[PDB]
Design a protein around this nucleic acid. Structure first.
Lengths: 211, 215
DNA sequence: CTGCAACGATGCTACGAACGTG
DNA sequence: CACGTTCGTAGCATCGTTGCAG
């Protein structure tokens, strides 16, 4: 199966392989997507609510005016050149939606060495698939469980759209003697490596001194 | 024109981009196109709703969509969208199309022809070509130019009134120079307007050149 | 059995959109 | 607010493969 990808809201056109470009042709589009109760077979004329979702073109190609999470699925076209010539096209469909730029909330202006502080919560909105969130300090990324470094993360799918919202709250115990003017950022690393990662603006709180 | 050029094969779907438009509805944009089907200027909307919904329908993402092209679809296509706000963007498209005829055929081809005089060598025929395109003769693989040394071509173009397509015929006759190649090779080559594609050649003919009985 | 042709697949380049900077 | 740079996306071209005919 040939792997495929496109942006939600975008049109989609699947080429039927080995099939007459002009009608009438003998061919079958059978697919299973989030819009299907089972394998669904759409005909040359097609019919039903499916004409508003995915339709067969006079040239034998299947088409979707707007693709959505609901459409991730399997698409197979078994077609008849003339008779009995037969070739079968096979596609595997992943989709995606680029979320709004990441934001740190509840970020710290000041913080104190030797113990934990709330650095902030990096928050992404409107992503599919969900993807990952990471943090970095002055150019380099950070890992939990190492030298008092932890994370409280979560993911939530907006009911209407089906997209995702990821929260990541950063917390660290600053070494005493370190960088008093440190810069932190968060980055959204998408599930499908379609685009490069997106990074929040930095935060440069001031490390202060206990007694 | 500010119009960019687009060229498509007949029968295939085309999709035109609306520059700087909302990717999801609701969107404000309206297409304008004067072509074969449009009486003058047809304006199309994201809602569509006319008889054009089975022909030209604006997609949810703003682009213009044609299920399969046809000759009548040749013309200019423009869009006006508003990037909110109030940013506003344009598109100018010239769209032409084409069809490719079957491999040209030869007919009425001389069994053998004789020198020192004109001869009916035959006729090339190409059907289903668009735009019209042309038929060029080649002797041995080298061009044959009319008006020059007994070389003549009786030519026509017949447009199928229904398919709006072209049936082509080119009849070549030649006066061979006495004492020429006794087994010369003719071919015929159809060519279209742009490098929209390559050239199609007819299976050659290798007639026998017989000399005139002495007087 | 061999050659030629057509179709499909991949790679490349150019055009447009976005993002950041001054 | 504008200009300029970069990423992303889309189209054209190239090459290889498979099919078909001689």
């Amino acid at each position: 199966a040939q792997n495929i990808t496109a942006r939600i809201g975008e049109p989609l056109v699947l080429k039927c392989k080995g099939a007459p470009k002009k009608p009438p042709q003998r061919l079958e589009w059978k697919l299973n997507t989030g819009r299907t109760e089972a394998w669904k077979v759409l005909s040359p004329q097609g019919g039903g609510p499916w004409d508003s979702v995915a339709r067969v073109l006079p040239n034998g190609s299947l088409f979707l005016p707007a693709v959505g999470i609901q459409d991730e699925g399997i698409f197979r076209c078994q077609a008849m050149n003339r008779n009995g010539k037969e070739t079968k096209s096979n596609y595997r469909v992943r989709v995606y939606q680029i979320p709004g730029k990441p934001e740190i909330v509840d970020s710290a202006s000041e913080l104190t060495a030797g113990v934990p502080n709330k650095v902030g919560t990096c928050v992404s909105e409107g992503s599919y698939p969900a993807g990952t969130l990471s943090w970095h300090l002055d150019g380099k990324p950070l890992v939990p469980n190492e030298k008092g470094v932890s994370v409280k993360e979560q993911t939530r799918r907006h009911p209407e759209t089906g997209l995702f919202t990821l929260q990541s709250e950063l917390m660290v115990t600053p070494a005493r003697g370190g960088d008093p003017r440190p810069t932190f950022s968060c980055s959204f690393s998408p599930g499908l490596p379609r685009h490069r990662a997106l990074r929040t603006a930095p935060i440069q709180p001031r490390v202060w001194e206990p007694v």
